[PDB]
Design an enzyme around this catalytic site. Sequence first.
Site, mmCIF file in Angstrom:
data_model
loop_
_atom_site.group_PDB
_atom_site.id
_atom_site.type_symbol
_atom_site.label_atom_id
_atom_site.label_comp_id
_atom_site.label_asym_id
_atom_site.label_seq_id
_atom_site.Cartn_x
_atom_site.Cartn_y
_atom_site.Cartn_z
ATOM 1 N N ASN A 121 5.810 -9.528 6.252
ATOM 2 C CA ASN A 121 4.687 -8.670 6.696
ATOM 3 C C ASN A 121 4.673 -8.709 8.221
ATOM 4 O OD1 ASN A 121 2.341 -7.329 7.271
ATOM 5 N ND2 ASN A 121 1.053 -8.525 5.918
ATOM 6 N N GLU B 176 -0.623 10.028 4.944
ATOM 7 C CA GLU B 176 -1.307 10.243 6.230
ATOM 8 C C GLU B 176 -0.352 11.031 7.126
ATOM 9 O OE1 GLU B 176 -2.808 6.454 7.666
ATOM 10 O OE2 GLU B 176 -3.529 5.930 5.632
ATOM 11 N N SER C 121 0.807 -1.231 0.000
ATOM 12 C CA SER C 121 0.000 0.000 0.000
ATOM 13 C C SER C 121 0.836 1.276 0.000
ATOM 14 C CB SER C 121 -0.983 0.011 1.136
ATOM 15 O OG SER C 121 -1.872 -1.120 1.075
ATOM 16 N N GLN D 224 -10.703 -4.981 0.868
ATOM 17 C CA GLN D 224 -10.305 -5.676 -0.375
ATOM 18 C C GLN D 224 -11.525 -5.873 -1.270
ATOM 19 O OE1 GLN D 224 -6.287 -6.638 1.106
ATOM 20 N NE2 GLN D 224 -7.268 -6.185 -0.857
ATOM 21 N N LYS E 68 3.352 6.364 5.327
ATOM 22 C CA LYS E 68 2.465 5.326 4.784
ATOM 23 C C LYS E 68 3.067 3.963 5.070
ATOM 24 C CE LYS E 68 -1.268 3.956 2.731
ATOM 25 N NZ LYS E 68 -1.306 2.777 3.627
ATOM 26 N N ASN F 195 -8.893 -0.677 -0.601
ATOM 27 C CA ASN F 195 -8.275 -0.856 -1.930
ATOM 28 C C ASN F 195 -9.263 -0.541 -3.042
ATOM 29 O OD1 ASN F 195 -5.623 -1.466 -1.272
ATOM 30 N ND2 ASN F 195 -6.045 -3.655 -1.077
ATOM 31 N N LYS G 112 0.014 3.389 -2.917
ATOM 32 C CA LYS G 112 -1.078 4.383 -2.947
ATOM 33 C C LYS G 112 -0.531 5.796 -3.021
ATOM 34 C CE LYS G 112 -4.451 1.458 -0.456
ATOM 35 N NZ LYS G 112 -3.740 0.176 -0.603
ATOM 36 N N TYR H 223 -10.747 2.296 5.389
ATOM 37 C CA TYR H 223 -9.555 2.118 4.538
ATOM 38 C C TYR H 223 -9.848 1.035 3.490
ATOM 39 C CZ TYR H 223 -4.649 1.236 3.358
ATOM 40 O OH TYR H 223 -3.464 1.084 2.712
HETATM 41 B B1 LIG Z 1 -2.001 -2.100 2.211
HETATM 42 O O1 LIG Z 1 -0.687 -2.504 2.398
HETATM 43 O O2 LIG Z 1 -2.525 -1.291 3.214
HETATM 44 C C1 LIG Z 1 -2.973 -3.202 1.583
HETATM 45 C C2 LIG Z 1 -3.852 -3.781 2.721
HETATM 46 N N1 LIG Z 1 -3.181 -4.619 3.735
HETATM 47 C C3 LIG Z 1 -3.587 -5.803 4.233
HETATM 48 C C4 LIG Z 1 -2.642 -6.174 5.138
HETATM 49 C C5 LIG Z 1 -2.522 -7.375 5.997
HETATM 50 O O3 LIG Z 1 -3.382 -8.226 5.869
HETATM 51 O O4 LIG Z 1 -1.592 -7.419 6.809
HETATM 52 N N2 LIG Z 1 -1.688 -5.201 5.170
HETATM 53 N N3 LIG Z 1 -2.017 -4.254 4.311
HETATM 54 N N4 LIG Z 1 -2.195 -4.264 0.927
HETATM 55 C C6 LIG Z 1 -2.748 -5.201 0.157
HETATM 56 O O5 LIG Z 1 -3.968 -5.243 -0.038
HETATM 57 C C7 LIG Z 1 -1.848 -6.288 -0.375
HETATM 58 C C8 LIG Z 1 -1.894 -7.574 0.403
HETATM 59 C C9 LIG Z 1 -1.965 -7.752 1.788
HETATM 60 C C10 LIG Z 1 -1.751 -9.157 2.131
HETATM 61 C C11 LIG Z 1 -1.712 -9.954 1.020
HETATM 62 S S1 LIG Z 1 -1.911 -9.070 -0.416
#
Ligand SMILES: *[B]([O])([O])[C]([C]N1[C]=C(C([O])=O)N=N1)[N]C(=O)[C]C1=[C][C]=[C]S1
Length: 360
Positions: free
Chosen positions: A342, A271, A62, A118, A314, A151, A65, A149
């Site tokens: 992550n 942000e 993200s 999502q 971000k 996507n 973004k 928030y």
């Molecule tokens: B972003 O990075 O904010 C966005 C949403 N997201 C979900 C998560 C999580 O589950 O820890 N972190 N950020 N990123 C995405 O949609 C991509 C993906 C997130 C997990 C697999 S694809």
Amino acid sequence: APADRLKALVDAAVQPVMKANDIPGLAVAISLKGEPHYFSYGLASKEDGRRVTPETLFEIGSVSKTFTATLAGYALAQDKMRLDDRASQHWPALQGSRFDGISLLDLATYTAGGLPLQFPDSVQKDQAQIRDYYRQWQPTYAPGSQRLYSNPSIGLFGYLAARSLGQPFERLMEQQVFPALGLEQTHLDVPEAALAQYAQGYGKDDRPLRVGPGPLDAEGHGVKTSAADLLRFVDANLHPERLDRPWAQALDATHRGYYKVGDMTQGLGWEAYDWPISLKRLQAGNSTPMALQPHRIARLPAPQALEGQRLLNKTGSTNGFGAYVAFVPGRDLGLVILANRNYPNAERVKIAYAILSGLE
Ligand SMILES: *[B]([O])([O])[C]([C]N1[C]=C(C([O])=O)N=N1)[N]C(=O)[C]C1=[C][C]=[C]S1
């Protein structure tokens, strides 16, 4: 020596967090008073022993973004769209849908009325499925009232900004945005010739993961870049006046706040927080509840300049990667932290806070 002090500061912030979160590899880049500094830790691939360097490509999720917001800033600078345009003015397939009543600003800042985090699993990366998803979608609450928030929200903002410029989003990013920002190690679709630099991602299982295709993935979360290129983008953000004027205006458009939720002021992509602020407050603004639950907004009477005594940030993730960017406009200070796990936002913010507090 200042270089020994800097390396000790960054090591002390990074190393315990890499241990505590089992992060295989992590790249730091710092911009301090016009000079870049790089610190690289661990492995880009545990399987082949490739070390992280400042040129290693990471998925930044993200953080993408902020790049989407910059392309929208360019469409705004070219008078091709306005933030108060209704979304259906830019895509005829949306005429007659609830997007007749939703602004580009609502999409950009997650206030269209409950578009989810999502796209649902039923929507594949397919133009017709995406079109049909938006045509049928109905708000849970009035557009402009609650931040959730999302996507699909900022994804559609990017998609419509691209339509306003008459070209596909991915093409505009590769052919116009990345070159204008001086980014030659930044990709939506990593070239075969560059794959040797692409780190492996490690999932919550410790299983291998690079991101798979999804609807509006480029707009929402699709960028791969190096710590060195992402710091060039931070330096563009710290000094928009150094770019040719349309692109300076595009970056300025991402430094305007529209509303507040708690301590956070929402811009396009970025942000913002007052600086200084406590670590616990910066963590709370980047918390799971902030990302996952709706929050009533406090709308600003006029957009607020996100500059001076502020930190802009971000977070971004994919299944195998965890990125964080922060910068302080009034101190000419910027930070990138890219990792191939992550790991929790709170831990990214803990590294960043230690470094930014020690640069002072
Ligand atoms: B972003 O990075 O904010 C966005 C949403 N997201 C979900 C998560 C999580 O589950 O820890 N972190 N950020 N990123 C995405 O949609 C991509 C993906 C997130 C997990 C697999 S694809």
